[PDB]
Amino acid sequence: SETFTRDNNMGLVKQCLSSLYKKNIQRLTKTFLTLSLQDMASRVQLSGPQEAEKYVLHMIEDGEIFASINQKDGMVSFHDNPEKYNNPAMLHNIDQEMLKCIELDERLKAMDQEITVNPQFVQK
Amino acid sequence: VENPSLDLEQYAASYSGLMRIERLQFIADHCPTLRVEALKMALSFVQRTFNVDMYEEIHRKLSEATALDTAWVEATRKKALLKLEKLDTDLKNYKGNSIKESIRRGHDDLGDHYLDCGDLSNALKCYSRARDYCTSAKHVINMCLNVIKVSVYLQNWSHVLSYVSKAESTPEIAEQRGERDSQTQAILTKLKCAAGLAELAARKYKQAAKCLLLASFDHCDFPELLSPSNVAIYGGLCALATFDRQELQRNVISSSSFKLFLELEPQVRDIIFKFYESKYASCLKMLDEMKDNLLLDMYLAPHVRTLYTQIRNRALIQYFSPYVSADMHRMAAAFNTTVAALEDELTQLILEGLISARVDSHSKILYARDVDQRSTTFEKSLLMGKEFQRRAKAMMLRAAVLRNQIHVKSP
Amino acid sequence: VIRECGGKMHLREGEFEKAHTDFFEAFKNYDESGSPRRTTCLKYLVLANMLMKSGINPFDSQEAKPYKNDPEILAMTNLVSAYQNNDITEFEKILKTNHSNIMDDPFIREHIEELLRNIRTQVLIKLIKPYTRIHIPFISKELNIDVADVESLLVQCILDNTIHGRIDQVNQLLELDHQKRGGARYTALDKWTNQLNSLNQAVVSKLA
């Protein structure tokens, strides 16, 4: 705690500790299709189903995980099915990502032709 | 429970030489069989062996039980030296006659008495003289077995592999077929179940099994090496863990050569044949029944942990292979375990790319998942594009800083 | 010199390919010389040609024509016919009616389960051809076996690359693989993406 507060980045370190839980919960999605809240708050060491409920709810609200809570059974159901690429809006994403590369290549050509005509780059 | 579920007489009969003494000391300095078997079994053969003192570390252990061979200790010390003098004088005579082209007889008995004394590779130079004053490859093949025998008690497994490679590669495919119907001598069996043993000690299980399963039961009697029974276990457990189903069927189950080996080891035969037929409820139980009998083996104990874990992981993948939606209750009842521990095992297996499955821990059902090729392709291509644009921007900035020659001076 | 009794436990083992090949030779060699063994030889000659699921009907191919049919053993001659037609009903009917006469024999103990398992395999393989999702209890009716036996047979068949499908335990199903999406275009796109990911780094690293 002395080094982390002498360098003034104390508070950016506690974010790593808080992010470890959010990383473990996301790692639960690669093995499970339906988990119990009491059972879930024993592998990520959250110590309580009540706190695991809000930990999952916050991650759902931020678009970090794809899941749904069931307070009746008290179980978290992982969906893991965001998108199928047949949307007329994904075409917009591909178009924008293509236009950015087109502009980048145009810039590269522009600052390449300025070297092609350099009088110093004719003697070597 | 550690119990003496072995008979010492058959172990003593199978082996001969220093290997028998080493095996007897190994089982002794573990903690089965000592109580009354140890003193009788070990002391019987120390009369003809050297270094004398090997008993004392195990001798005082009888005190808590609450020998008398004290005069014999000084008896062997004075008599050991006499055998060395004649052979030390003998090698001078062989050089005196200048018959070095035919002194191969001189090293015929020179190397055996050295190994009888528990000496070291210092004698091995004589076998080098075999390479220098011989013409036909037959003497080289002869001395290769001797050097392998003396290197077995040397922990020089890589050195053993190099010499087996030399002995198998230098001649023409080991005398081709060996004057038809195989050679009269069984040196092929030794070159097979010595390189396989060395690969086993090198933690190369698949190659060890592949070499050991190719042995022959013609002579197969190896007092200086692993017993015929041990070949079956070494080649069976090492094959159940690394061989695929097709390889298991072609090289083990259908092979006539290994069936004779499996005849005298019923437990391994039943284990293999019930693993193949998808009967894991009792295959694992029989595998566990003999776990505290291979831990007392000298060449297989350290790997018992690695093999038994590797076999089980190969069963779990095989059990969940024809199924698209399996019940975890019957899955756990067929592995002699509980659902709570089976869930941990399956989670560990799924975390790595071994099983493509998802656990439903509400009705306890293991579902088989299928990856969407199109979505995965789109995701990875978009990620690659993002990384490429980031690298392009970084490189352009690097070009700007390099052109302007921006750096921090030492001052 | 006799292999009975004193040498019998050497021959008590089941592996008989050596005699399987020699049966065709012994059909003629000991025909007029091995008279005591002729009664048992004619029954066993069928087995050798029966194990490879080939050889049409040995009822009249070779010189066994004088023997042809024998009045006491007739379903034994039709056993190979039923095997060739892959009709389980004829096989089971023959076994139940003519028991103690086809089965009586010893050498049939070691081979009856082998025989009445390669008919069910072909019947099941043909049965699943037009379906994409089948019911295990429905297969349990065509084959005169229980559910627990047909599930094990399906597992063994699926393992040895003979049935391209997967079982559904909780629903007692069998889902067969029938659809083949484009698997060559996306693999090519993956290879192209993965190769560009390395070419870009190689190009960028030149500006060190």
Notes on the protein architecture:
Chain C: This is COP9 signalosome complex subunit 2. Chain C: One of its GO terms (biological process) is negative regulation of transcription by RNA polymerase II. This is part of a larger assembly, with chains A (124 residues), B (411 residues) and C (208 residues). With 124 residues, chain A is mainly α. Helix content of chain A is 51%, strand content 10%. Chain A has a domain of 55 residues. Chain A contains 5 helices and 3 strands, in the order ααβααββα. Chain A has a 3-stranded antiparallel β-sheet with strand order 1-3-2. The longest helix of chain A is centred in the last third of the chain and has 27 residues. Chain A is elongated and about 75 Å long. The relative contact order of chain A is 0.08. Chain B has a 3-stranded antiparallel β-sheet. By secondary structure, chain B is mainly α. The longest helix of chain B is centred in the C-terminal third of the chain and has 32 residues. Chain C is built from 9 helices and 3 strands. In chain C, 55% of the residues lie in helices and 5% in strands. Chains B and C meet through β1 and α21 of B and α8, β2 and α9 of C. β1 of chain B pairs parallel with β2 of chain C.
The geometry of chain C reads as: elongated
Query: Which structural category fits the helices and strands of chain A?
Result: mainly alpha
Continuous helix count of chain A: 5
Distance between the termini of chain C: 88 Å
PDB class: metal binding protein
Keywords: signalosome, CSN5, metalloprotease, signaling protein, metal binding protein
Entry title: Cryo-EM structure of COP9 signalosome
Chain A: COP9 signalosome complex subunit 3
What's this entry about, in short?
Chain B: Pfam families: CSN1_C, PCI, RPN7. Chain B: Residues 211-373 form the PCI domain. This is part of a larger assembly, with chains A (124 residues), B (411 residues) and C (208 residues). Chain A is mainly α.
List the SSEs and their pairings.
This is part of a larger assembly, with chains A (124 residues), B (411 residues) and C (208 residues).
Chain A: H1 2-6, H2 14-27, E1 32-36, H3 37-40, H4 49-61, E2 67-70, E3 75-78, H5 90-116
Antiparallel strand pairs in A: 1-3, 2-3
Chain B: H1 8-14, H2 18-29, H3 34-43, H4 56-59, H5 71-96, H6 104-116, H7 125-132, H8 137-152, H9 157-169, H10 187-201, H11 205-212, H12 228-242, H13 245-253, H14 256-263, H15 266-276, H16 280-289, H17 291-294, H18 301-319, E1 323-327, H19 328-333, H20 339-351, E2 357-360, E3 365-368, H21 373-404
Helix pairs in contact in B: 2-3, 6-7, 8-9, 9-10, 10-11, 11-12, 12-15, 12-18, 15-16
Chain C: H1 8-11, H2 17-29, H3 35-51, H4 75-85, H5 88-97, H6 109-127, E1 133-135, H7 136-142, H8 147-159, E2 165-168, E3 173-176, H9 185-204
Antiparallel strand pairs in C: 1-3, 2-3
Helix pairs in contact in C: 2-3, 4-5, 7-8
